[PDB]
Design a protein around this ligand. Structure first.
Ligand code: MN
Length: 440
RNA sequence: AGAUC
């Protein structure tokens, strides 16, 4: 557990705190109050807007500069503590700007494998190792450890069973015979839609959660009755339910780079241990309501090296300026997930600004932005969106999607580099069509 | 699938 000793330079502390143990509502305030007392320049790193909003609740009234729109408080101007999301921190490290020389970095959910979180751990741990700063990483599953069954406030009954992943008409009576409340993690929105329809058909009350619907739908879990929450991994962090069962497919979709050539949303494939621990961690939280059960349908992923986020983290970190041209390393327990030589992705000055602008203003995925920038293409030149090979054609409703270009021509979306994330769902395609049209 | 400005 935490002690003020850990606030000295050259100390990186990983607080292994199991789900429900108090990372956000107990330990984080404790750390922040001591940093405020001792006037340490501190940044708090939340993985998501949601967790940031949860953080402000727990830090209510303390002098914290919230560098996120997810929170709106009056700032005194004397605030020495900043709060932002992992991706915001990493993006700002990429700008030609003045990053404060924070003495203390506090990262909550330090297992997050978003490429910007991985890159932030690399930068932060390198700065600690150089003697410049102190850092505290909090998670239930410290990087480098593979325990899918961490401790809990109340004992959890874990049972491996065949978990249905499609609509069913028989053979799974235990799903619907249950009279409690179930949180069911599914690999995708479309997959949860089919299961939710099947459960609704059988007379259950279902709330569905995803990135696209979380805002409006999650509050319903607080105020309406419900039998099932069917959720994507949106609910792995910063989401809590009054449930007594989790059903876990133990699968996910994850971006994968095929042959160095393109990015697909591979799967469904096994989740990591960290993600299984988070999913299981939705229950077993209430010592007054024992009896919770975790029903899971397969193993966890033994190697995450196929995940594109590892290489994308190195693309960010190779281009984050440290000191007179040094390059930060990935956080050591995770450094073996990428086999690329040191500095392989460092871009020269001009191509680097393009990569940065492609990601921030352009909102392209890291891997894609890097392909464009490293080809010498300028930010506003969108011709590559239309001149790929035929197998790069983006479909809409099984018909080649089309775009009115800045030159008043209707062209089929066929990007020179295919990254499935630009058209994996409706909002993504819409954002990329605007990009291909020259609108941002 | 997720993520930020
Ligand atoms: Mn927490």
């Amino acid at each position: 557990c935490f002690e003020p000793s850990m606030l000295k330079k050259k100390q990186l502390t990983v607080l292994d705190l199991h789900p429900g143990a108090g990372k956000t509502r107990r330990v984080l305030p404790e750390i922040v109050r001591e940093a405020i007392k001792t006037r340490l320049r501190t940044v708090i790193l939340a993985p998501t807007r949601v967790v940031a909003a949860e953080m402000e609740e727990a830090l209510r009234g303390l002098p914290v500069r919230y560098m996120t729109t997810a929170v709106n408080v009056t700032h005194s101007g004397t605030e020495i503590v900043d709060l932002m999301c992992h991706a915001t921190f990493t993006s700002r490290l990429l700008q030609p700007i003045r990053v404060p020389n924070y003495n203390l970095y506090i990262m909550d959910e330090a297992h997050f494998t978003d490429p910007s979180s991985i890159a932030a751990r690399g930068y932060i741990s390198t700065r600690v190792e150089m003697g410049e700063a102190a850092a505290i990483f909090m998670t239930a599953t410290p990087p480098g450890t593979r325990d899918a069954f961490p401790d809990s406030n109340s004992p959890i009954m874990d049972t491996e069973v065949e978990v249905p992943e499609r609509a069913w008409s028989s053979g799974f009576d235990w799903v619907t015979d249950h009279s409690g409340k179930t949180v069911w993690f599914v690999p995708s929105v479309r997959n949860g839609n089919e299961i939710a329809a099947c459960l609704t058909k059988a007379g259950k009350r279902v709330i569905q959660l995803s990135r696209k619907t979380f805002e409006t739908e999650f509050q319903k879990t607080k105020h309406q009755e419900w039998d099932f929450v069917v959720t994507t991994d949106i609910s792995e962090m910063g989401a809590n339910f009054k449930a007594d069962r989790v059903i876990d497919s133990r699968r996910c979709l994850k971006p994968v780079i095929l042959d160095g050539e393109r990015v697909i949303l591979a799967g469904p494939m096994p989740v990591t241990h960290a993600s299984a621990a988070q999913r299981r961690g939705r229950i077993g939280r209430n010592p007054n309501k024992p009896g919770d059960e975790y029903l899971y349908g397969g193993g966890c992923a033994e190697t995450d090296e196929d995940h594109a986020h590892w290489l994308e983290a190195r693309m960010l970190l190779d281009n984050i300026y440290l000191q007179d041209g040094l390059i930060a390393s990935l956080y050591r327990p995770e450094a073996d997930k990428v086999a690329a030589i040191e500095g392989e992705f460092k871009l020269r000055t001009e191509q680097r600004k393009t990569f940065v602008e492609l990601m921030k203003r352009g909102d392209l995925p890291v891997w894609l932005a890097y392909q464009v920038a490293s080809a010498g293409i300028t930010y506003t030149d969108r011709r590559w969106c239309f001149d790929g090979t035929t197998n790069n054609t983006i479909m809409e409703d099984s018909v080649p999607a089309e775009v009115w270009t800045r030159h008043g021509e209707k062209r089929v979306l066929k990007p020179r580099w295919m990254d499935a994330r630009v058209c994996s769902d409706h909002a993504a395609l819409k954002s990329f069509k605007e990009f291909a049209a020259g609108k941002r």
